[PDB]
Write an enzyme that holds these catalytic residues in place. Structure first.
Site, PDB file in Angstrom:
ATOM      1  N   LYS A  35       0.746  -9.868   6.293  1.00  0.00           N
ATOM      2  CA  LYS A  35       0.226  -8.825   6.484  1.00  0.00           C
ATOM      3  C   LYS A  35      -1.167  -8.452   7.034  1.00  0.00           C
ATOM      4  O   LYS A  35      -1.561  -7.785   7.828  1.00  0.00           O
ATOM      5  CB  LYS A  35       0.349  -7.818   5.348  1.00  0.00           C
ATOM      6  CG  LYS A  35       0.076  -6.511   5.261  1.00  0.00           C
ATOM      7  CD  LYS A  35       0.231  -5.523   3.968  1.00  0.00           C
ATOM      8  CE  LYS A  35      -0.948  -5.656   3.164  1.00  0.00           C
ATOM      9  NZ  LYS A  35      -0.726  -4.763   1.749  1.00  0.00           N
TER      10      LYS A  35
ATOM     11  N   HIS B 163       5.340  -2.867  14.042  1.00  0.00           N
ATOM     12  CA  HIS B 163       6.182  -3.214  13.297  1.00  0.00           C
ATOM     13  C   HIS B 163       6.586  -1.907  12.351  1.00  0.00           C
ATOM     14  O   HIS B 163       6.255  -0.822  12.419  1.00  0.00           O
ATOM     15  CB  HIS B 163       5.445  -4.053  12.283  1.00  0.00           C
ATOM     16  CG  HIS B 163       3.917  -3.448  11.788  1.00  0.00           C
ATOM     17  ND1 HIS B 163       2.814  -3.560  12.625  1.00  0.00           N
ATOM     18  CD2 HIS B 163       3.467  -2.983  10.715  1.00  0.00           C
ATOM     19  CE1 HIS B 163       1.978  -3.128  12.059  1.00  0.00           C
ATOM     20  NE2 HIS B 163       2.192  -2.641  10.881  1.00  0.00           N
TER      21      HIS B 163
ATOM     22  N   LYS C 112     -10.101  -2.203   2.834  1.00  0.00           N
ATOM     23  CA  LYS C 112      -8.874  -2.092   3.595  1.00  0.00           C
ATOM     24  C   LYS C 112      -8.979  -2.611   5.178  1.00  0.00           C
ATOM     25  O   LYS C 112     -10.140  -2.431   5.876  1.00  0.00           O
ATOM     26  CB  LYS C 112      -8.107  -0.699   3.848  1.00  0.00           C
ATOM     27  CG  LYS C 112      -7.774  -0.152   2.421  1.00  0.00           C
ATOM     28  CD  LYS C 112      -6.915  -1.172   1.950  1.00  0.00           C
ATOM     29  CE  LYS C 112      -5.802  -1.512   2.457  1.00  0.00           C
ATOM     30  NZ  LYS C 112      -4.459  -2.241   1.852  1.00  0.00           N
TER      31      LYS C 112
ATOM     32  N   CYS D 190       0.667   5.092   1.716  1.00  0.00           N
ATOM     33  CA  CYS D 190       1.223   4.293   3.131  1.00  0.00           C
ATOM     34  C   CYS D 190       1.471   2.807   2.842  1.00  0.00           C
ATOM     35  O   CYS D 190       0.719   2.284   1.789  1.00  0.00           O
ATOM     36  CB  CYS D 190       0.297   4.498   4.255  1.00  0.00           C
ATOM     37  SG  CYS D 190      -0.165   6.339   4.561  1.00  0.00           S
TER      38      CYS D 190
ATOM     39  N   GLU E 138      -0.626   0.927  -5.657  1.00  0.00           N
ATOM     40  CA  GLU E 138      -1.966   1.445  -5.085  1.00  0.00           C
ATOM     41  C   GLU E 138      -2.503   2.468  -6.395  1.00  0.00           C
ATOM     42  O   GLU E 138      -3.622   2.612  -6.621  1.00  0.00           O
ATOM     43  CB  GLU E 138      -1.785   2.106  -3.821  1.00  0.00           C
ATOM     44  CG  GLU E 138      -1.456   1.274  -2.803  1.00  0.00           C
ATOM     45  CD  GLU E 138      -1.443   1.801  -1.368  1.00  0.00           C
ATOM     46  OE1 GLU E 138      -1.706   3.002  -1.322  1.00  0.00           O
ATOM     47  OE2 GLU E 138      -0.854   1.399  -0.322  1.00  0.00           O
TER      48      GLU E 138
ATOM     49  N   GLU F 258      -3.165   0.106  14.450  1.00  0.00           N
ATOM     50  CA  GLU F 258      -1.912   0.248  13.710  1.00  0.00           C
ATOM     51  C   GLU F 258      -0.934   0.442  14.798  1.00  0.00           C
ATOM     52  O   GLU F 258      -1.296   1.409  15.775  1.00  0.00           O
ATOM     53  CB  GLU F 258      -1.772   1.043  12.629  1.00  0.00           C
ATOM     54  CG  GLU F 258      -2.176   0.689  11.385  1.00  0.00           C
ATOM     55  CD  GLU F 258      -1.085  -0.010  10.677  1.00  0.00           C
ATOM     56  OE1 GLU F 258      -0.910  -0.557   9.293  1.00  0.00           O
ATOM     57  OE2 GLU F 258      -0.077  -0.933  11.591  1.00  0.00           O
TER      58      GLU F 258
ATOM     59  N   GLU G 149       3.089   1.422  14.834  1.00  0.00           N
ATOM     60  CA  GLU G 149       4.322   1.392  13.710  1.00  0.00           C
ATOM     61  C   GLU G 149       5.165   2.494  14.063  1.00  0.00           C
ATOM     62  O   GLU G 149       4.967   3.696  14.576  1.00  0.00           O
ATOM     63  CB  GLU G 149       3.590   1.678  12.157  1.00  0.00           C
ATOM     64  CG  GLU G 149       2.383   1.015  11.749  1.00  0.00           C
ATOM     65  CD  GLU G 149       1.743   1.388  10.284  1.00  0.00           C
ATOM     66  OE1 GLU G 149       1.526   2.479   9.697  1.00  0.00           O
ATOM     67  OE2 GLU G 149       1.629   0.249   9.784  1.00  0.00           O
TER      68      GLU G 149
HETATM   69  C1  LIG Z   1       0.881   2.636   8.480  1.00  0.00           C
HETATM   70  C2  LIG Z   1       0.968   4.382   8.335  1.00  0.00           C
HETATM   71  C3  LIG Z   1      -1.053   2.677   8.395  1.00  0.00           C
HETATM   72  O1  LIG Z   1      -1.467   1.724   8.821  1.00  0.00           O
HETATM   73  C4  LIG Z   1       1.225   2.319   7.171  1.00  0.00           C
HETATM   74  C5  LIG Z   1       0.304   1.295   6.518  1.00  0.00           C
HETATM   75  O2  LIG Z   1      -0.194   1.654   5.151  1.00  0.00           O
HETATM   76  P1  LIG Z   1      -1.271   0.762   4.797  1.00  0.00           P
HETATM   77  O3  LIG Z   1      -1.915   1.384   3.515  1.00  0.00           O
HETATM   78  O4  LIG Z   1      -2.184   0.214   5.578  1.00  0.00           O
HETATM   79  O5  LIG Z   1      -0.549  -0.511   4.300  1.00  0.00           O
HETATM   80  P2  LIG Z   1      -0.811  -1.511   3.035  1.00  0.00           P
HETATM   81  O6  LIG Z   1      -1.953  -2.260   3.259  1.00  0.00           O
HETATM   82  O7  LIG Z   1       0.321  -2.538   2.852  1.00  0.00           O
HETATM   83  O8  LIG Z   1      -0.960  -0.647   1.744  1.00  0.00           O
HETATM   84 MG   LIG Z   2      -1.200   1.395   1.639  1.00  0.00          MG
HETATM   85 MN   LIG Z   3       0.656  -1.848   9.784  1.00  0.00          MN
END
Ligand SMILES: *[C@](C)(CO)CCOP(=O)(O)OP(=O)(O)O
Ligand SMILES: [Mg+2]
Ligand SMILES: [Mn+2]
Ligand SMILES: *[C@](C)(CO)CCOP(=O)(O)OP(=O)(O)O
Ligand SMILES: [Mg+2]
Ligand SMILES: [Mn+2]
EC number: 5.3.3.2
Lengths: 180, 176
Positions: free
Chosen positions: B18, B29, B52, B64, B84, B111, B113
């Protein structure tokens, strides 16, 4: 760099290293805040860099700083506009000279300041300083004031407080006129 | 933990760690987006931790994430809500099933997606994971929408895209 310490009145009593001054127990000091408009009358909104000790990554008005020893507040405004945004400006106007603010940021850092507010027009292009500003937008003031009204928790608290001061707000509005 | 790479069509074709997956060149993805409301009908809006990798410090919809291989969208949501926000939720309901987007964050992290959008109600109190969320606010959807309509730049780009989808807005507006 330093901040100018103020006693429990707005009277200067000495100076203090910038980084070292801003902690969980920040003492009263002098600062400024400025609202910048382009020729078209749009407001420049900016986002603090993630490395700012206080309110990193937060959306706020154009430019804030700390006057140094022997510096007029107006010179400080000119200087940080150059340093943070690389931008030249018209003479800053005082729009809220008595603004005063104390508040804690999401990680515990405290700002406690005497912070006169100014407005000015930009007269050059921007050269954003990435160590200070991570993002920005040129906006119509009305929109910004509508966002602040609907979701004030999404912007710096001092932007919200200044914007909702009646007299300050009227000055901001005047700067939305298109000027060539 | 990983993300699932998708070909032009949404077929899974493999995975990537990730963290290593989000770069200036992020490849397409699988993901999800979820909007959470409490029993009073308030919308949870969150602010992403400064750590993040993508959009740190940015205000966004409630939760998310990235479903893992073999995991349903609804389980991923439940998983990330727990992870979270330490919160239990009702069964996630579809609100924008064909949402997809690509965007670039202020540091150039992308991103990219396929990101079906859901909604649910919380059934427990939050217990915040500060590795993921640095701030949050319970508020009225209507105000949030005004904010999004007035100053979209103050919110994550995908939050804005979802809320201004005519259908998804009608469906969120019913959770209050
Ligand atoms: C897309 C909408 C945003 O990048 C989905 C990813 O959510 P995100 O919180 O960034 O993923 P995690 O880090 O797994 O929580
Ligand atoms: Mg998230
Ligand atoms: Mn992503
Ligand atoms: C007060 C308004 C902080 O809210 C003045 C601080 O501005 P800041 O930009 O943080 O100071 P500098 O680092 O000198 O630019
Ligand atoms: Mg500054
Ligand atoms: Mn200060």
């Amino acid at each position: 760099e330093h901040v100018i310490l103020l006693n429990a009145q707005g009277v200067p009593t000495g100076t203090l290293e910038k980084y070292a001054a801003h902690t969980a127990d920040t003492r009263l000091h002098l600062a400024f805040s400025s609202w910048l408009f382009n020729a078209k009358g749009q407001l420049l909104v900016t986002r603090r860099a993630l490395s700012k000790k206080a309110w990193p990554g937060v959306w706020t008005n154009s430019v804030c700083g700390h006057p140094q020893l022997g510096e007029s507040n107006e010179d400080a405004v000119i200087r940080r506009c150059r340093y943070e945004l690389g931008v030249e400006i018209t003479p800053p106007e005082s729009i809220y000279p008595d603004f005063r603010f104390r508040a804690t940021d999401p990680s515990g850092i405290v700002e406690n300041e005497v912070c006169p507010v100014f407005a000015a027009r930009t007269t050059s292009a921007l050269q954003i300083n990435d160590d200070e500003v991570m993002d920005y937008q040129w906006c119509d003031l009305a929109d910004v004031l509508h966002g602040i009204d609907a979701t004030p928790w999404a912007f710096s608290p001092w932007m919200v407080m200044q914007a909702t001061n009646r007299e300050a707000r009227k000055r901001l509005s005047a700067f939305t006129q298109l000027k060539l």
